[PDB]
Amino acid sequence: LDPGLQPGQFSADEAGAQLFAQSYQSSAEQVLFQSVAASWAHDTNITAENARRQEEAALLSQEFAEAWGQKAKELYEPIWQQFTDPQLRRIIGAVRTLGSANLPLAKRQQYNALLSQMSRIYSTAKVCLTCWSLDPDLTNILASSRSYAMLLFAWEGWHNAAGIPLKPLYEDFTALSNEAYKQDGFTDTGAYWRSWYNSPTFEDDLEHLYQQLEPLYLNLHAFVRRALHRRYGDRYINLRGPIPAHLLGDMWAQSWENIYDMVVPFPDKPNLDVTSTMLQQGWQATHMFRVAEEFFTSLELSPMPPEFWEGSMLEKPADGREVVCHASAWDFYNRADFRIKQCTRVTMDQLSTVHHEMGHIQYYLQYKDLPVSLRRGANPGFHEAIGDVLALSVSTPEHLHKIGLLDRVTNDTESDINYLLKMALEKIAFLPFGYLVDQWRWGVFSGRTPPSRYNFDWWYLRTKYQGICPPVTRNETHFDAGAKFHVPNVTPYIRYFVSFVLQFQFHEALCKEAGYEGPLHQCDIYRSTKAGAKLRKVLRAGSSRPWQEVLKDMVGLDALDAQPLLKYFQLVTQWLQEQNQQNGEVLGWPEYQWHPPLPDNYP
Ligand SMILES: *[C@@H]1O[C@H](CO[C@@H]2O[C@@H](C)[C@@H](O)[C@@H](O)[C@@H]2O)[C@@H](O[C@@H]2O[C@H](CO)[C@@H](O)[C@H](O)[C@H]2NC(C)=O)[C@H](O)[C@H]1NC(C)=O
Ligand SMILES: CCC[C@H](N[C@@H](C)C(=O)N1[C@H](C(=O)O)C[C@@H]2CCCC[C@@H]21)C(=O)O
Ligand SMILES: *[C@@H]1O[C@H](CO)[C@@H](O)[C@H](O)[C@H]1NC(C)=O
Ligand SMILES: *[C@@H]1O[C@H](CO)[C@@H](O)[C@H](O)[C@H]1NC(C)=O
Ligand SMILES: [Cl-]
Numbered sequence: 001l002d003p004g005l006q007p008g009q010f011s012a013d014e015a016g017a018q019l020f021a022q023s024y025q026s027s028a029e030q031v032l033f034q035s036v037a038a039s040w041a042h043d044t045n046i047t048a049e050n051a052r053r054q055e056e057a058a059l060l061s062q063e064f065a066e067a068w069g070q071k072a073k074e075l076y077e078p079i080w081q082q083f084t085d086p087q088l089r090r091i092i093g094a095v096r097t098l099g100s101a102n103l104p105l106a107k108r109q110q111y112n113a114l115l116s117q118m119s120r121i122y123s124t125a126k127v128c129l130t131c132w133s134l135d136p137d138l139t140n141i142l143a144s145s146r147s148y149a150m151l152l153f154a155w156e157g158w159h160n161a162a163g164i165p166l167k168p169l170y171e172d173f174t175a176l177s178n179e180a181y182k183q184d185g186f187t188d189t190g191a192y193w194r195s196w197y198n199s200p201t202f203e204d205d206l207e208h209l210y211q212q213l214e215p216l217y218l219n220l221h222a223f224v225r226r227a228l229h230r231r232y233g234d235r236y237i238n239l240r241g242p243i244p245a246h247l248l249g250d251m252w253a254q255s256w257e258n259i260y261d262m263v264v265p266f267p268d269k270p271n272l273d274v275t276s277t278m279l280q281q282g283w284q285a286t287h288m289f290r291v292a293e294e295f296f297t298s299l300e301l302s303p304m305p306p307e308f309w310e311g312s313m314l315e316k317p318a319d320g321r322e323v324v325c326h327a328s329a330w331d332f333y334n335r336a337d338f339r340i341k342q343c344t345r346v347t348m349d350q351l352s353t354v355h356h357e358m359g360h361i362q363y364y365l366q367y368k369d370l371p372v373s374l375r376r377g378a379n380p381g382f383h384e385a386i387g388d389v390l391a392l393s394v395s396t397p398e399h400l401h402k403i404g405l406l407d408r409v410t411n412d413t414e415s416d417i418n419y420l421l422k423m424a425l426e427k428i429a430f431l432p433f434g435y436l437v438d439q440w441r442w443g444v445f446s447g448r449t450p451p452s453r454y455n456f457d458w459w460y461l462r463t464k465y466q467g468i469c470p471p472v473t474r475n476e477t478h479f480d481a482g483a484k485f486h487v488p489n490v491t492p493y494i495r496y497f498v499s500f501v502l503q504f505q506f507h508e509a510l511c512k513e514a515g516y517e518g519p520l521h522q523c524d525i526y527r528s529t530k531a532g533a534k535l536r537k538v539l540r541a542g543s544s545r546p547w548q549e550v551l552k553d554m555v556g557l558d559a560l561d562a563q564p565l566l567k568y569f570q571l572v573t574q575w576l577q578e579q580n581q582q583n584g585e586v587l588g589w590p591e592y593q594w595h596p597p598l599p600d601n602y603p
C-alpha cells in the first residue's frame with residue numbers, strides 16, 4: 001500500500017477516532033475511485049486485460065481495507081460502540097468490517113478471480129443455432145414472441161448457457177465469502193447482508209408483510225393464468241397448476257408488464273402501453289434520460305452534471321465490443337463523476353428503468369458531501385425506491401398525456417381498472433420473486449442448501465412463491481439461480497422486496513405533501529417543489545441516521561407497512577377477486593407436480 005494511503009497514529013479515544021476518520025476519508029476516495037474506475041473500464045469493455053486490471057484494483061482495495069480496518073480495531077475495538085458521536089460510530093463500525101480483506105492473499109486472489117470469471121460468464125453467454133445475446137435478443141423474444149416453442153428455446157437456451165458453467169464457481173465463491181465474513185463475527189455472509197437493516201426481527205417482519213400481500217398475488221396469478229389458457233390451450237396451461245415460467249414476458253417471470261395486451265380488462269379504453277407511441281415518435285435513449293432528468297428538476301432536485309452526460313453509456317455499443325448490459329448507476333466517490341451504464345431500448349418499461357437508475361444517481365448527488373462511509377441509502381431498500389417513486393407519477397395516464405405519450409384523456413372506472421391491472425403486472429407480480437431470491441441465497445450461505453440441492457431448492461421456492469414451473473426438465477447439473485444477474489454479480493436482492501413496499505409509503509407521503517387530494521393511484525407529484533424538499537431531506541441523510549428515524553420523519557411511521565400498497569391497489573384487488581369467483585377459478589396451484597409437455601417438433 002502506497003505510503004500516502006497507509007494509516008498513521010491516533011490516540012485511543014473519540015477525539016483520535018475523529019482525526020482517524022478524516023485521514024481515512026482523504027485516502028479512501030482515491031482507493032474507491034481507482035476500484036470503480038477499473039470496474040467501469042471492464043464492464044463497458046469486457047477483455048482479459050481489463051479483468052486483470054480490475055483484479056489488481058480490487059486487491060489494492062483489500063490492502064487498504066485491511067490496513068485501516070486493523071488499525072481501527074487496534075485503537076477503538078473496546079470503545080467505538082460508546083462514542084457520543086453517532087455518525088462517527090457508524091464510520092468506525094464500517095471501517096472495522098474487513099470482509100474479503102480478512103482472507104489471506106492467495107484466497108483474496110481466488111475470490112477476486114471468481115467474481116471476475118462469474119461476471120464474464122453471465123455477461124458473455126450466448127444462445128446459438130449466429131448467436132443471440134440476452135440483451136437485446138432474448139429479452140425481445142421473451143417480451144413479444146407468443147410462440148410457445150420460440151419462448152421455450154430462448155428460456156432453456158439462456159438458463160443452460162448461463163447457469164451450467166457458473167455452478168462450480170459459485171460453490172467456491174460461497175465458501176470464500178463465508179470464511180471472510182466469519183472473521184468479522186458473522187455466522188455467514190447472509191447474516192452480514194441482513195445486518196444492514198439493523199432490525200432483530202427482520203425475517204419475521206418480512207414474512208408478516210408477505211402474508212398481507214400474498215392474496216393480491218394469488219388473484220393476479222389466477223386471472224393471468226386464465227388469459228394464458230385462452231391463448232395457449234389446455235395442453236400447455238393447467239388451470240390448477242403452476243404457470244410455465246417462460247410465458248410471462250420476462251426471462252425470470254419477475255414482472256409481467258409485457259403480457260399486458262393479453263390480459264387487459266377493457267380494450268376499448270385508452271391504450272396504456274405507450275411503447276408504440278414512443279417508436280412512432282422516434283424516441284431515443286438520450287430523450288428518455290432527458291425526460292427523466294426534467295422530472296427531477298421539476299421537484300427542484302439536481303440536474304445530471306456534465307460529467308454524467310460525457311461519461312455515461314446509454315446505448316449498447318454498435319462496434320460489437322462486449323459489455324455488461326444489465327443497467328447500473330455508478331458513484332466514483334470523487335464527488336464529480338457519476339454515470340449510468342445501460343443498454344437502453346425504446347420501450348415504456350425501459351423508461352421506468354431509466355427513472356430507477358436516475359434515482360440512484362440523484363441519491364449520489366445529494367449525499368456526495370458526506371464521509372465516504374455514509375454515502376449509501378438509509379438502508380439498501382431506500383436506494384432502490386427513489387426512482388420507482390417518481391416513475392409511479394410518470395406512468396399515470398394524466399402524466400403521460402402531459403409529455404405527449406397518451407392523446408386520449410379518460411377518468412372512469414374501466415380506465416382505472418386497466419391502469420391498476422397494468423401496475424399490478426409490474427409491482428404485485430414481482431413481490432414473490434423479490435422475496436424468494438434471498439431466501440434461496442440465505443439458505444446457500446448458511447449451508448441449509450448445499451451444492452447438491454441448489455436447483456431443487458431454487459425451484460421449490462419458485463413454485464412455492466411464484467406458482468411457476470420450469471417448461472423443460474431440470475436436474476442438479478442445471479443452476480437456474482445462476483441465470484439471474486444478481487447471483488453471479490453478488491448483488492443482494494431483498495432490497496427490491498423492501499423497495500416495492502417502501503415506494504408506496506413514500507408515494508403516499510409525497511402526494512399528501514404535494515397537497516393532492518384524490519385517489520392515490522392518480523397522483524402526479526410533477527412540479528411539486530414541496531414534495532421535492534421532503535424527498536431531498538431523505539437523500540441528503542445518506543446512512544448517517546437509522547433508517548427507522550428517517551422513515552418516521554418522512555412518512556410519519558417507523559416501520560415498513562403494506563397499507564399504502566394495499567390502498568393504491570384497492571379497486572383492482574376487489575375487482576380481481578370478483579372476476580376470479582365468477583369464473584370459478586382455483587386460487588393457487590394445487591397440482592404442484594405439473595409440468596407442461598414438450599412442443600411437437602422441439603427443438
Ligand atoms: C377522476 O374522478 C375522481 C372521482 O371523483 C369524482 O368526484 C366528483 C369530483 C365528481 O366529479 C364525480 O363524478 C366523481 O365521483 C376524482 O376524485 C375526487 O377528487 C376530489 C377532489 O379532488 C376528492 O375530494 C374526492 O374524494 C375524489 N373522489 C374519490 C371519492 O375518490 C379524481 O380527482 C379524478 N381524477 C382525475 C385524474 O381527474
Ligand atoms: C447492480 C444493481 C443493478 C440494478 N439494475 C436493475 C435493472 C435491476 O436489476 N432491477 C431488478 C431486476 O431487474 O431484477 C428489479 C428492480 C425493480 C425495477 C426495475 C429493475 C430493477 C439496480 O440499479 O438496482
Ligand atoms: C477496450 O480495452 C482494450 C484493452 O483491453 C483497449 O485497448 C481498447 O481501447 C478498449 N476499447 C475502447 C474503444 O474503449
Ligand atoms: C441432466 O439433464 C441433461 C439434459 O436434460 C442430461 O444430459 C443429464 O444427463 C442429466 N443428468 C445429470 C446427472 O446431469
Ligand atoms: Cl439488501
Ligand SMILES: [Zn+2]
Nearest residue numbers: 356360383384
Ligand atoms: Zn437499483
